[PDB]
Amino acid sequence: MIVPVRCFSCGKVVGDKWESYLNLLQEDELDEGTALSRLGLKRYCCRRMILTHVDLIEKFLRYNPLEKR
Amino acid sequence: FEDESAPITAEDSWAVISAFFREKGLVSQQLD
Amino acid sequence: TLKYICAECSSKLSLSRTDAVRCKDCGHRILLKARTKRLVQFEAR
Amino acid sequence: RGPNLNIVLTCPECKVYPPKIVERFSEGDVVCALCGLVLSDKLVDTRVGEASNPLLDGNNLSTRIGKGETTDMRFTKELNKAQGKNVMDKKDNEVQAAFAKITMLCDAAELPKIVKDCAKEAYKLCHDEKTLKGKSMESIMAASILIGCRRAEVARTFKEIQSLIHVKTKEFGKTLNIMKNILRGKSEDGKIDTDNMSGAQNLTYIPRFCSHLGLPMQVTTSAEYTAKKCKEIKEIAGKSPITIAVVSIYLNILLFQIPITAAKVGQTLQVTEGTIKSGYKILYEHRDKLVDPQLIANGVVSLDNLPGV
Amino acid sequence: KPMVNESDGVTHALYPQEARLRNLTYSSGLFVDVKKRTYEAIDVPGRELKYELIAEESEGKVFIGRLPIMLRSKNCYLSEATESDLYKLKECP
Ligand SMILES: [Zn+2]
Ligand SMILES: [Zn+2]
Ligand SMILES: [Zn+2]
């Protein structure tokens, strides 16, 4: 639902690169392959962590809050 | 593309499929 | 005592055993029990 | 007046009476909570059986005859014919027939299952009594339905019941009073009524009346406050609750400026327009006390929006 | 349109989310126009009759039951709802 904090296989921290990855795709006009390498994700265990992630949090945030303060 | 009468390839068939599901969907028979 | 929340207008209500189950503001008939105010412990594993 | 035939579980060793007993459903054991001695083993839980309610039908076990995977119509017809020619079941069939008609009447008005259950129960309790022998069956069914609706806090009006069941008001009123007396008599013998049993209970009518007119829920709440405070005026307190509710609704209709004329409000609710306007004059002099303070304070409704004569 | 009548007799529009939570049936009402005509004639013995309209032809809407409505159908509330509208109604696009 949200970007994992650590790579499942080797434990590298990948939860602080989601926004950078999206920025590279949008503003830098880079393909997903080049963006992953620029972020320092070399082992393919880490690449699939960011490459195949589905951000379902955005869909959930569209619903109005159940309890508003 | 270049000519409006050139034959299509097998890759262009997926565009037709995409149009089909945009109009019908996956549960068209139930609703229809 | 108990504070309830409407499921359509998010209005916090207070209902008793005699009060009818319904929102007094918008008229909805679905109410969500409010989150407990007691702290809950969780393990980060 | 009969054999005891009662089993009480007590621990022989502890001898404390009454004993602390814990029923371990998972382990199927009954054990003394003090010494741990097991008092009984192999306890059973608490298809092949049918569940029936012995409050509307009492004790009456019967089985129907119908076609199976293979059957000839000759046997089914004659077997059904033989079953009908029974003297013991005839007495109860009249009560059962009454329940069937009550269910049809209740189901034709779109009422909850609780009402028909209450209505059927009321009929059974008041049936087979000497007092109810000269009254038409239609009056009895209508009175039971009205009682059933009252017990469910969804009480209807006399006119609403008279729309489906046709019985003149004189018999309707007399039957209802007799029926209420019967319930009171059997309530002391062994409850039946509460604050809802009160005849007026005008607050219950407002939600349905406004719904028929299609007004928003905000108007309904204002009318409820107006009707509740409407009982402080002696000149209106003695009026019929229907008129009190309708006139209160009419005051709120004009307060919020809904484009619905009195000619249709009285046509839909079957209330004379003159009565609505006649009651408005009495209700117009106490407008300041008949408007919710919070609604006026917020600014949604102002007392200057109500036309004055 | 889909609707539900409560115990007190108040009827309001019913949406799929409420029906699921309240264990209610998502259905609409059916109404039919009914015309009631009555004919009478003088039945002279041993002759065929000629029935004639006797100036009594009543002609109102009669409720005949509720029809369950399939979701995302022409009669459902979600057919005319956009993606934002579905989110407001707590429905998954
Ligand atoms: Zn890795
Ligand atoms: Zn609400
Ligand atoms: Zn013991």
Swiss-Prot record, chain A:
InterPro entries: RNA_pol_su_RPB10 (IPR023580), RNA_pol_suN_Zn-BS (IPR020789), RPABC5/Rpb10 (IPR000268). GO terms for molecular function: DNA binding; DNA-directed RNA polymerase activity; zinc ion binding. It comes from the Eukaryota. There is a cross-link at residue 59 (Glycyl lysine isopeptide (Lys-Gly) (interchain with G-Cter in ubiquitin)). Its main location: nucleus. The keyword Nucleus applies. It is found in: Nucleus, Nucleolus. GO terms for biological process: nucleolar large rRNA transcription by RNA polymerase I; ribosome biogenesis; RNA-templated transcription; termination of RNA polymerase I transcription; termination of RNA polymerase III transcription; transcription by RNA polymerase I; transcription by RNA polymerase II; transcription by RNA polymerase III. PROSITE patterns: RNA_POL_N_8KD. The keyword Transcription applies. Belongs to the archaeal Rpo10/eukaryotic RPB10 RNA polymerase subunit family. Component of the RNA polymerase I (Pol I), RNA polymerase II (Pol II) and RNA polymerase III (Pol III) complexes. Component of the RNA polymerase I (Pol I) complex consisting of 14 subunits: RPA135, RPA190, RPC40, RPA14, RPB5, RPO26, RPA43, RPB8, RPA12, RPB10, RPC19, RPC10, RPA49 and RPA34. The complex is composed of a horseshoe-shaped core containing ten subunits (RPA135, RPA190, RPB5, RPO26, RPB8, RPB10, RPC10, RPA12, RPC19 and RPC40) where RPA135 and RPA190 form the DNA-binding cleft. Present with 5300 molecules/cell in log phase SD medium. This is DNA-directed RNA polymerases I, II, and III subunit RPABC5. The gene is RPB10.
From Swiss-Prot, chain B:
This is DNA-directed RNA polymerase II subunit RPB2. The binding of ribonucleoside triphosphate to the RNA polymerase II transcribing complex probably involves a two-step mechanism. The initial binding seems to occur at the entry (E) site and involves a magnesium ion coordinated by three conserved aspartate residues of the two largest RNA Pol II subunits. Present with 18700 molecules/cell in log phase SD medium. The lineage of its organism: Eukaryota, Fungi, Dikarya, Ascomycota, Saccharomycotina. DNA-dependent RNA polymerase catalyzes the transcription of DNA into RNA using the four ribonucleoside triphosphates as substrates. Second largest component of RNA polymerases II which synthesizes mRNA precursors and many functional non-coding RNAs. Proposed to contribute to the polymerase catalytic activity and forms the polymerase active center together with the largest subunit. Pol II is the central component of the basal RNA polymerase II transcription machinery. Belongs to the RNA polymerase beta chain family. It comes from Saccharomyces cerevisiae (strain ATCC 204508 / S288c). The chain holds residues 18 to 49 of 1224 of the full protein. It is found in: Nucleus. It comes from the Eukaryota. Component of the RNA polymerase II (Pol II) complex consisting of 12 subunits.
UniProtKB/Swiss-Prot annotation, chain C:
It is found in: Nucleus, Nucleolus; Peroxisome. GO terms for cellular component: cytoplasm; nucleolus; nucleoplasm; nucleus; peroxisome; RNA polymerase I complex; RNA polymerase II, core complex; RNA polymerase III complex. GO terms for biological process: nucleolar large rRNA transcription by RNA polymerase I; ribosome biogenesis; RNA-templated transcription; termination of RNA polymerase I transcription; termination of RNA polymerase III transcription; transcription by RNA polymerase I; transcription by RNA polymerase II; transcription by RNA polymerase III. The N-terminus is blocked. Its main location: nucleus. Zn(2+) binds at residues 6, 9, 23, 26. It comes from the Eukaryota. GO terms for molecular function: DNA binding; DNA-directed RNA polymerase activity; zinc ion binding. A zinc finger (C4-type) spans 6-26. Belongs to the archaeal Rpo12/eukaryotic RPC10 RNA polymerase subunit family. Present with 907 molecules/cell in log phase SD medium. This is DNA-directed RNA polymerases I, II, and III subunit RPABC4. The lineage of its organism: Eukaryota, Fungi, Dikarya, Ascomycota, Saccharomycotina. The chain holds residues 26 to 70 of 70 of the full protein.
From Swiss-Prot, chain D:
One of its GO terms (molecular function) is TBP-class protein binding. Belongs to the TFIIB family. Associates with TFIID-IIA (DA complex) to form TFIID-IIA-IIB (DAB-complex) which is then recognized by polymerase II. GO terms for biological process: DNA-templated transcription initiation; RNA polymerase II preinitiation complex assembly; transcription open complex formation at RNA polymerase II promoter; transcriptional start site selection at RNA polymerase II promoter. One of its GO terms (cellular component) is nucleus. The gene is SUA7. The keyword Iron-sulfur does not apply. InterPro entries: Cyclin-like_dom (IPR013763), Cyclin-like_sf (IPR036915), TFIIB (IPR000812), TFIIB_CS (IPR023486), TFIIB_cyclin (IPR013150), Znf_TFIIB (IPR013137). Keywords: Metal-binding, Nucleus, Repeat, Transcription, Transcription regulation, Zinc, Zinc-finger. Its main location: nucleus. PROSITE patterns: TFIIB, ZF_TFIIB. Sequence repeats lie at residues 105-181, 209-285. Present with 6750 molecules/cell in log phase SD medium. It holds the Pfam family Zn_Ribbon_TF. General factor that plays a major role in the activation of eukaryotic genes transcribed by RNA polymerase II. A zinc finger (TFIIB-type) spans 7-40. It comes from the Eukaryota. This is Transcription initiation factor IIB. SUPFAM superfamilies: Cyclin-like, Zinc beta-ribbon. Zn(2+) binds at residues 11, 14, 32, 35.
